[model samples]
Target: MKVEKEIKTNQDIDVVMTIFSDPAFTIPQIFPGIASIKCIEPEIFEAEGKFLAFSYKVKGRVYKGVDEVRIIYDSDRGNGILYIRKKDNNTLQIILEHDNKLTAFLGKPYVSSNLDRLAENIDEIIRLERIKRKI
Candidate 1:
């Protein structure tokens, strides 16, 4: 199944990118179902003019799969990590795209609902981080 979500935030794109790129930001913390994120392999490199690319595998109580995620500085199309840095109110628009087979086995709502929960948790985390840095 293919999932596309656009998350609006007042935080800068660089802040979101840093948190996304960090390995310590485990799957279980961001989303439910996933019990843990064991980095079977950590590969980061430039590809196709994008900022960076990473491929890793994770497993948990309900599911286990490999996901290749990336970070693109700026783009219009859903370039996996696409974002629009400028807006009338200065808010950043971040887009997330995931094409996973999990939906076939886990059901569409199961995957999408978890993604919604993940987005909320991520927002909370970012909020806390911002407070921590006094930004």
Candidate 2:
């Protein structure tokens, strides 16, 4: 399944990038259906390579071994992409692709909800920062 969304913020792209890159923000909290996540290979900006382990739950079902995923970020353009793939039956397959093309197998409505939540989060954080600076 591929899911893509666009979240806009009034803050500069750099500020958005900072907030997005911070692990303290927590993925499970930001993204629904994902129960937990941890760094696998860490994140690199220039190389656009970030690996993570994830635990997913939906309805009453629990899934594991689906933990490994690669996240690609293009902060240079203030755009990000998520590449969710897996090797199944000895064949490498793509599960989700979130990018400029805004593709996802999770469907549009769910992806739209996530984008809305992300935008709100970014806006609120920047608003607080601006208030702290009295700007």
Candidate 3:
């Protein structure tokens, strides 16, 4: 089962880019169950992580393609909205497009019951992860 969706993090674009690039960041942020993510092949960014109890392979493709930039920011250099302009203003615009799917397992992994709680306590979760020095 392939669940195609995205998660939005208002963290600065540049920071978010680097943060997401961290293999461990994804499993901790999205997975409710304990998952240990590692980079088996660093050259291609391929990762080997265990989700729940199943050991799985990962592509480690955390990239910012600007999934949907809306409009006006086309090839126009002047009117373009620079995401990495290093502006200090707080603006929520980055949407991390994550494509996750289990081919053979094909099962819904970890839900942990409450779906809303993840969004509500994301800050606290980040703090906890930060304390763990894995975020």
Candidate 4:
């Protein structure tokens, strides 16, 4: 199954992507319940169609499969968005799969369902982008 959804951000494209790029600002840190994020390999910053792949484990689960994510940099200050697409039939589509699956899998709703938390945390990611510009 394929799932997709877009999250609007206040920050521009450069700032938006930078937030996700930062090593200091890990996903589990911002959203509690995430035990740790061990990178499978270095992030692929290239703009090619290829994706950045990694393996992640929840608090309880051993190790999940590789999830490949491509960062498609769009041009525009408007709708500075991160769209999540998942290739799993069991996974809850869109934002849930990309952002909150492990959290949900651990028997908790850290930020509502899928799109619900995306709506909530998109701004937080944007804020980090703003900080990146200054430094």
Candidate 5:
């Protein structure tokens, strides 16, 4: 299944990247269903979570080579990749493409919900940060 979203933040992309890559902030939101997560390696995490009616056994790894931060997931369901990259200094595009055992049936909606929720989380975080700077 593949689902994606784009968000343009008032803060510079560099600033947004800082928060997104900071495991402390993004980990929970990134894997909102994840009940627990621990770093198995730098920018790599092992997590167990529930998605819809499914339980996920997955590990996620991050790569920040350029102005983009990419994550790859190896999971019990299947492998997947998430791209959160720069469209401009203040714009971001989030892309999630993963395999689903049930993709042959119905899995797009689950991934769709996740993408929308994920975008909202990031959006709110950046908006709050902008508000904080004003205070």
Candidate 6:
């Protein structure tokens, strides 16, 4: 099951991508349900590649399984996505993608309810670029 939400932030794209790509700052660090996360491989840029071993504990659930994620990022464009192939058959295969599209906001950075904000941020950035470049 999945839920969607959106929020606007005044943060720059670089800052957003840095925060998004930072495993220590992004996943287990920010997410309440995440148990532990350690980066196995680090990429110079978002396009290079990222590898991480992570596990999470769901509320009222005892099952917590460690899984590896293959992350891909677009450096020039400042976009990134994550894919997970479950090692254990007990859980369903899930692929989560995030691209920080920047959106216009009247105020300061706001809190987002879900990871979808990251993607929305990317969309807004792309839209702004498109309008500026007339592309």
Candidates in order, TM-scores: namely 0.45, 0.40, 0.40, 0.38, 0.76, 0.31
Query: Which candidate leads in TM-score?
Result: 5
lDDT per prediction? 0.39, 0.39, 0.36, 0.36, 0.69, 0.34
The model with the greater TM-score, 1 or 3, is 1
Model 5, residue 73: C-alpha shift (Å): 1.1
RMSD of 1: 11.5
**Candidate 4 collision pairs:** none
Model 5 accuracy (lDDT, Cα): 0.69
**For residues 1-135, could you state the per-residue lDDT of candidate 2 as single tens digits?**
355444555565444343344332324323434434444433432222111332222111112224234444332212344432333322222222434342232334544565557545756775675576454
Total clashing pairs in model 1: 0
Cα error, candidate 4, residue 32 (Å): 9.3
lDDT of 3 at 61: 35
- After superposition, candidate 2 runs with Cα above 4 Å error: 23-26, 40-108, 126-135
Give the per-residue lDDT digits (tens) of candidate 3, residues 1-135.
222222344444444444434545543444334344455542123334344555554443333444222111211111112121122333233222223334223223343322234445545655565667643
Provide the lowest-lDDT 10-residue window in model 4. Answer: 72-81
What lDDT would candidate 3 get against the real structure?
Answer: 0.36
Worst 10 residues of 6 by lDDT: 102-111
- Give the per-residue Cα lDDT of candidate 3 at 80: 18
Candidate 4: Cα lDDT at 51: 11
Candidate number with the higher TM-score (1 or 6): 1
Better of 3 and 6 by lDDT: 3
Ordering by TM-score: 5, 1, 3, 2, 4, 6
